[PDB]
RNA sequence: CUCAAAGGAGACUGCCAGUGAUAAACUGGAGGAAGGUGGGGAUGACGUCAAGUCAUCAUGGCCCUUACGACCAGGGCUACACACGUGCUACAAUGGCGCAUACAAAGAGAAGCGACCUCGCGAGAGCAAGCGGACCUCAUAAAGUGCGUCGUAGUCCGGAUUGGAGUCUGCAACUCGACUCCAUGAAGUCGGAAUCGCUAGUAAUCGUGGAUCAGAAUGCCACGGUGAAUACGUUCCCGGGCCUU
């Protein structure tokens, strides 16, 4: 806004957990507020990455955000003449913010048969840097690269 | 720490009555335990937050009657009551729990719907011509 | 529709006529505006002049119209198709 | 036992109804319980405000009526008859219960 | 697996693999089970025929496919030919229970055909 | 509303109040179960004889000081345009500008 | 823009209601439109009586109508002759028995209702209007009050093009709801068609 | 004790620190339920658009007066090659269906709300308590949770359309009512250019009530339940405020 007077609100931690990350999460995956049943598919799809993993369900997570997370994005900037895509950094908060959508995004847009299975199968592949999200990442980091001449705008 | 000490608790339209007094930990609530009572694993913890903060989970023993609202307001309730009953029972509890945060009466209300308005803030579709 | 407890709707003063009709010979049309009233199966043969809000349109009673209302045969509305 | 049953528009006004009740009611032997607020009502209403169109412009007017209940219990003779002759204010609804 | 002259679904349960006769829905289908004495959640492929035949008399004590499509059409040629004002809507192709033409009735109606010229 | 248009209404309370009880009675012979099936069709017979007006389904609410058919208000007694005016002015007892 | 009523937005604060009597809905229409009927009888009757204010009170099955004016002695005649006939047609309108009493009004030049009216005869009577309105803001303000507004509107002078045309002194704050504003209009009838008139009178925060 | 409703207290940059022109004020901290206009509403300046309303009402002028006035029955305002606006329901598995089981607020009621019991698959019917109401009735909240099934299919999605049979209101459901049962089972598999709302208990989603009203809401007004995302910033689009040219 014009003013700059927003705060941050408090996030609850989850349940199983009590990891606001986690949180976050489902509160991404959650639709028309029914935060139960979008906390019920999150922990059905941990507990699946957690048995075909070695690792904890915490841990498999950062190992997912830590390959979806993006550095560099590119925003419009518009000066005397034409707007050029200025590639910028993205601080962390974004960077998780923007793991996450683009994880719920992909698995929303799979094509298993529930959507904890979708979300497992996505995290997965995250794990293993495949699949979408992961290139979406890559797309962006491309777009970055390509418009890298104009990083002082 | 040998009488009944009381709590109010409110949130949204709930009202909650919280008795607390030397015990092992048994929690009742409208005559149901807790499990019982809240299907919610967020709501359990709310109810559960100030204890495990005070590390006086297992002293004491919970009788609590709520009315109106819902699960997420009973348990938000619940949660102010019990923690006005523990500053009624110890008075250097306040500061810990003010810290948390729980001391806090949320006041956030179901704003009132508007004429010319769809909800109290969501407007009819806008059209030019 | 008309609840059955109730039994069929019929004006009286139709009623009266297709009374006075039926045992005469009478085979000139009957007139009325009531197209409310059910039709009977006592009139099947004479020709009732239902009115359809400007004139009286003859309709010849069969058996197959019995528990129907007189108006289902006189239509209201004049309509030839959009620029036919 | 008897049940006075107080309505008004105006709260002051039905204050001082219940106060001059309670007052006659106990100089005359008998005790009375209460007076007790009853939940008060609230009617509303939604006008439009132009004589033709502009849908969206609106009133919104209220009606509150409050209710007092007031106890007598072992009502005497003396206190019974010291009741109907009060004549209370305009605007102030009383029924009487012999319950 | 042939019920009333047609073939019914092998793989589904048998109340939702019976609605497949034209004239029996799910009421009728759930009725016609429990005259049979057979649960609604059981294949039809592991039937014997023994319950095969005890469904079909069921079924015909109903009046099904062509039957039932003979009544419709009979109903729908009397108000036709009859000419009362649902037998005029059924001649042109209108809605027949009074709903707005100016909009929608595009269900009786079709796809709409813009004007030429 | 046009004078015509307020005679008509007051004509019809009137007839309605004369035929009240004329027309409960044959409605519940009309509605009784054990009733037989030919007092019924006279009753059903006799009921359209009476004149429409006397029907409380023809009365249309009116604004008592305008006439208006629209906008009507039972508590009051008065079209929306006239409780305005009289609540403003102060004349309908504990009606105020409402907010909550 | 619009403006909100003056007097309805006081109605609850510092300004008291011109009906005082409780009903339940069986009956509350029926006593709106008695006195509906009571109060138009008695505008009709007491025109020259210079009348500001009818307060209309219900005890119990009877009617109590208060009459605020400036000219008690016309409105009750001689030895209460006129009074007890408006008593015998108010009791005849109300279908219950009825009590008159006069209120006096000192000062009408201070009672926006009177300031109204008395500027409607004068323009009636073809008075131009600039002094009708000029000579009532300085009767107000120089009888004391803390401020007064008057307003009209129409074909001023017969002019073909209506318009508005108002004048203030000292200060009116139409905001302020603890404010003492005695507001009310009037309509003049004149060859060339209603003329309205606004009068806003402020006498001091309470 | 919750609560009902009357009377009071409380929040005032009041206190502390820093900055600031020894100012106004700003930034942060303490205490507190609430911190800087605490949240929401009411409240709309001088004026603008010869903006809307002579069909709420009133009113100048004009016009009709065995008619442009008055009464009645039937019809129409519900038409239908098409075009636009505002909504509702969907296209499904974060779901449909079946069983079981929790947790609201607000409001209305006497030609009214109508319980219990019996009958009917059902809409309802018969009989008949209580209530002018914190007492009785409307009146089971639903989403939610547990178990089972459906297994990606134009389907156990969707429920338009039509046939048959009924109920209730009402003199009277043809034109032209609402609701119920059986059958029927359309388009639709996420929508071009373009375009709308929303900054927090908001959006989204889920039910509930009321006015109008004999009957007739997906509209309007109102009430709770669950409950987000995001705001780096003011270069750009729209509207506006102040100074200057
Ligand atoms: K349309
Ligand atoms: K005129
Ligand atoms: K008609
Ligand atoms: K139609
Ligand atoms: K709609
Ligand atoms: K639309
Ligand atoms: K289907
Ligand atoms: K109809
Ligand atoms: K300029
Ligand atoms: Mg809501
Ligand atoms: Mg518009
Ligand atoms: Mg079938
Ligand atoms: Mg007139
Ligand atoms: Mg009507
Ligand atoms: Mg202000
Ligand atoms: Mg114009
Ligand atoms: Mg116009
Ligand atoms: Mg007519
Ligand atoms: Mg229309
Ligand atoms: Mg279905
Ligand atoms: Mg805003
Ligand atoms: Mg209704
Ligand atoms: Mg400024």
Same mark, same amino acid.
């Given at each position: ?153 | ?129 | ?84 | ?99 | ?117 | ?50 004149? @429409?007006?006397?029907?409380? /389904? *023809?009365?249309?609410? =009116? ?9 009507? !208000? @039972?508590?009051?007694?008065? /079209? *929306?345009?006239?409780? =305005? ?9 504990? !009606? ?5 | ?206």
């Amino acid at each position: 806004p014009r003013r700059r007077v927003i705060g941050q609100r408090k996030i609850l931690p989850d349940p199983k957990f009590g990891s606001e990350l986690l949180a976050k999460f489902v509160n991404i995956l959650m639709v028309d507020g029914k935060k139960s049943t979008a906390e019920s598919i999150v922990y059905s799809a941990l507990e699946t990455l957690a048995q075909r993993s070695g690792k904890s369900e915490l841990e498999a997570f950062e190992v997912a955000l830590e390959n979806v997370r993006p550095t560099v994005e590119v925003k419009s900037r518009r000066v005397g003449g034409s707007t050029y895509q200025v590639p910028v950094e993205v601080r962390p908060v974004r960077r998780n913010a923007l793991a996450m959508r683009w994880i719920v995004e992909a698995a929303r847009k799979r094509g298993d048969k529930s959507m904890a299975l979708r979300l497992a199968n996505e995290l997965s592949d995250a794990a293993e840097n495949k699949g979408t999200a992961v290139k979406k990442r890559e797309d962006v980091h491309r777009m970055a690269e390509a418009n890298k001449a104009f990083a002082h705008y | 720490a040998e009488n009944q000490y009381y709590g109010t608790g409110r949130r949204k339209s709930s009202a909650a009555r919280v008795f607390i007094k030397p015990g092992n930990g048994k929690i009742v609530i409208n005559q149901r335990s807790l499990e019982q009572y809240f299907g919610r694993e967020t709501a359990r913890m709310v109810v559960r937050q100030p204890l495990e903060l005070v590390d006086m989970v297992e002293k004491l023993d919970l009788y609590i009657t709520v009315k109106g609202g819902g699960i997420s307001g009973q348990a938000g309730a619940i949660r102010h009551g019990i923690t006005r009953a523990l500053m009624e029972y110890d008075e250097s509890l306040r500061s810990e729990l003010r810290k948390a945060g729980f001391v806090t009466r949320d006041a956030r209300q179901v704003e009132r719907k508007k004429v010319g308005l769809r909800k109290a803030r969501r407007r009819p579709q806008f059209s030019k011509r | 529709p008309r609840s059955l407890k109730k039994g069929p709707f019929i004006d009286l003063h139709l009623l009266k006529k297709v009374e006075k009709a039926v045992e005469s010979g009478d085979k000139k049309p009957l007139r009325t505006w009531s197209r409310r009233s059910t039709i009977f199966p006592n009139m099947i043969g004479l020709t009732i002049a239902v009115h359809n809000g400007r004139q009286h349109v003859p309709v010849f009673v069969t058996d197959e119209m019995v528990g129907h209302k007189l108006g289902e045969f006189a239509p209201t509305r004049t309509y030839r198709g959009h620029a036919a | 036992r008897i049940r006075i049953r107080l309505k008004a528009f105006d709260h002051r006004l039905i204050d001082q109804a219940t106060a001059e009740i309670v007052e006659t009611a106990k100089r005359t032997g008998a005790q009375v319980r209460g007076p007790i607020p009853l939940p008060t009502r609230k009617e509303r209403f939604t006008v439009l405000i132009s004589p033709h169109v502009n849908k969206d412009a609106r009133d919104q007017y209220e009606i509150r009526t409050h209710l007092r209940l007031v106890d007598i219990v072992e009502p005497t003779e003396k206190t019974v008859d010291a009741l109907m002759r009060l004549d209370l204010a305009a605007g102030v609804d009383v029924q009487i219960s012999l319950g | 697996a042939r019920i009333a002259g047609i073939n019914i679904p092998d793989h589904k349960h048998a109340v939702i693999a019976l609605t497949s006769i034209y004239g029996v829905g799910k009421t009728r289908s759930k009725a016609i089970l429990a005259a049979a004495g057979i649960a609604e959640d059981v294949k039809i492929s592991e039937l014997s025929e023994g319950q095969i035949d005890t469904l079909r008399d069921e079924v015909a004590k109903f009046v099904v496919e062509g039957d039932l499509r003979r009544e419709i059409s009979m109903s729908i040629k009397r108000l036709m030919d009859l000419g009362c004002y649902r037998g005029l809507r059924h001649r042109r192709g209108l809605p027949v229970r009074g709903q707005r033409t100016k909009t929608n009735a595009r269900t009786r109606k079709g796809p709409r055909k813009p004007i030429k010229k | 509303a046009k004078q015509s248009m307020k005679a008509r209404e007051v004509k019809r309370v009137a007839l309605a109040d004369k035929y009240f009880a004329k027309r409960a009675e044959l409605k519940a012979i009309i509605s009784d179960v054990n009733a037989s099936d030919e007092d019924r069709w006279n009753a059903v017979l006799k009921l359209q004889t009476l004149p @429409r007006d006397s029907s409380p /389904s *023809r009365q249309r609410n =009116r604004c008592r000081q305008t006439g208006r058919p629209h906008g009507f !208000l @039972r508590k009051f007694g008065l /079209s *929306r345009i006239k409780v =305005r005016e009289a609540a403003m002015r102060g004349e309908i007892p504990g !009606l105020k500008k409402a907010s909550w | 823009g619009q403006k909100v009523h003056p007097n309805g937005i006081r109605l609850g604060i510092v300004k008291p209601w011109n009906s005082t009597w409780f009903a339940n809905t069986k009956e509350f229409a029926d006593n709106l439109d008695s006195d509906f009927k009571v109060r138009q009888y008695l505008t009709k009757e007491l025109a020259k009586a210079s009348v500001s204010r009818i307060v209309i009170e219900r005890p119990a099955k009877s009617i109590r109508v208060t009459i605020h004016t400036a000219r008690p002695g016309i409105v009750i005649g001689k030895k209460g002759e006129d009074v007890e006939k408006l008593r015998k047609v108010v009791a005849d309108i109300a279908g219950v028995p009825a009590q008159i009493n006069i209120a006096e009004v000192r000062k009408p030049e201070l009672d926006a209702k009177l300031v109204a009216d008395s500027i409607t005869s004068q323009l009636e009577r073809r008075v131009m209007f600039r002094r009708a309105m000029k000579r009532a803001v300085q009767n107000a303000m120089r009888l004391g009050a803390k401020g007064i507004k008057v307003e009209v509107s129409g074909r001023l002078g017969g002019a073909e093009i209506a318009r508005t045309e108002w004048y203030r002194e000292g200060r009116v704050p139409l905001h302020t709801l603890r404010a003492d504003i005695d507001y009310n209009t009037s309509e003049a009838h004149t060859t060339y068609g209603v003329i309205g008139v606004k009068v806003w009178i402020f006498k001091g925060e309470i």
